[PDB]
């Protein structure tokens, strides 16, 4: 690895996941470093995983070999995301811009090389000094979070449908010993037609060591599982808890806890019963039952992503499949 990395450094190369991953480890180390003076030559290095993004003489600089266009797609706690165009190939994709000082190699490790349709393909990453750029398929339907905001709430059938696809994605991750670390609506991306969903945002991902146990800071407070808050050992079940919080979010048009408690929520999530009281009463028995098994406080008793995927698939059948329209009528969220 050490020899490989040395070769990659200073250059933007076409290559494969492991190369990107190995280089990304060096980036995390440099982000921790003390403030230094800017040199005259700003380091430009990375690797791209598709020939639709082409370096030129081992360089890939914004406003030279590529550019952003139009308004921002979105911004989370760590990165701004834009549409982009490669000036050589004309290819369009998304860029997530992250400062080196907050970057984590795991964000790439957790999705470079993967090939689930429920996970955004990673196209590569290059850095211009402290500016990290992460390239990935552009999805024109926005985030599930944006949809929930627009529509107010989602119908039970849309909610079940998307939760199911998320769990397909989590099962793929979990079987590869990857924890997503921040499952929520804002980190699920949609097609133009709203038919396909894919997980994004591996900024809080951790690579579960062969043990299958974890380092792990959670991404979003409202979606934290009790075992996390209690500071105990964490596994993939953490994600299924999160997915059920996202489920509640879609149904009620608001995160769990929020309407009832003022932060911090660590105390509450640990102290209180799981927020199954926030399951709408109008929900079908199989929906309520899935959400309840996913919000078991003891992770050992909590269902796996695969197990829950089954339950929610059947619950969708019970409500009579995906009938509701895409971008339908507004639904008033639960009020406090
Ligand atoms: N590939 C993409 N295509 C379209 N929109 C995207 C894409 N990636 C991200 N977005 C949007 O940009 C937002 C922020 O991107 P994220 O990757 O979630 O960044 P982030 O939330 O800062 O990451 P964390 O907090 O470090 S896990 C998402 O909520 C989406 O709305
Ligand atoms: Mg995000």
Curated annotation (Swiss-Prot):
ATP binds at residues 73-81, 96. Residues 67-316 form the Protein kinase domain. The active site is at residue 182. It is found in: Cytoplasm. Residues 68-314 are annotated as: Interaction with ZFP91. The modification Phosphothreonine is found at residue 220. Weakly expressed in testis, small intestine, spleen, thymus, peripheral blood leukocytes, prostate, ovary and colon. Autophosphorylated. Phosphorylation at Thr-220 is required to activate its kinase activity and 'Lys-63'-linked polyubiquitination. Phosphorylated by CHUK/IKKA leading to MAP3K14 destabilization. Ubiquitinated. Undergoes both 'Lys-48'- and 'Lys-63'-linked polyubiquitination. 'Lys-48'-linked polyubiquitination leads to its degradation by the proteasome, while 'Lys-63'-linked polyubiquitination stabilizes and activates it. Residues 326-335 have a biased composition (Basic and acidic residues). It is linked to Immunodeficiency 112: An autosomal recessive, primary immunologic disorder characterized by variable abnormalities affecting lymphoid immunity, including hypogammaglobulinemia, lymphopenia or paradoxical lymphocytosis, and recurrent bacterial, viral, and fungal infections. Lymphotoxin beta-activated kinase which seems to be exclusively involved in the activation of NF-kappa-B and its transcriptional activity. Phosphorylates CHUK/IKKA, thereby promoting proteolytic processing of NFKB2/P100, which leads to NF-kappa-B activation via the non-canonical pathway. Has an essential role in the non-canonical NF-kappa-B signaling that regulates genes encoding molecules involved in B-cell survival, lymphoid organogenesis, and immune response. Could act in a receptor-selective manner. Belongs to the protein kinase superfamily. STE Ser/Thr protein kinase family. MAP kinase kinase kinase subfamily. Interacts with TRAF2, TRAF5, TRAF6, IKKA and NFKB2/P100. Interacts with TRAF3 and PELI3. Interacts with NIBP; the interaction is direct. Interacts with ARRB1 and ARRB2. Interacts with GRB10. Interacts with ZFP91. Interacts with NLRP12; this interaction promotes proteasomal degradation of MAP3K14. Directly interacts with DDX3X. Interacts (via C-terminus and kinase domain) with PPPC3A (via N-terminus) and PPP3CB. This is Mitogen-activated protein kinase kinase kinase 14. It comes from Homo sapiens. The chain holds residues 334 to 675 of 947 of the full protein.
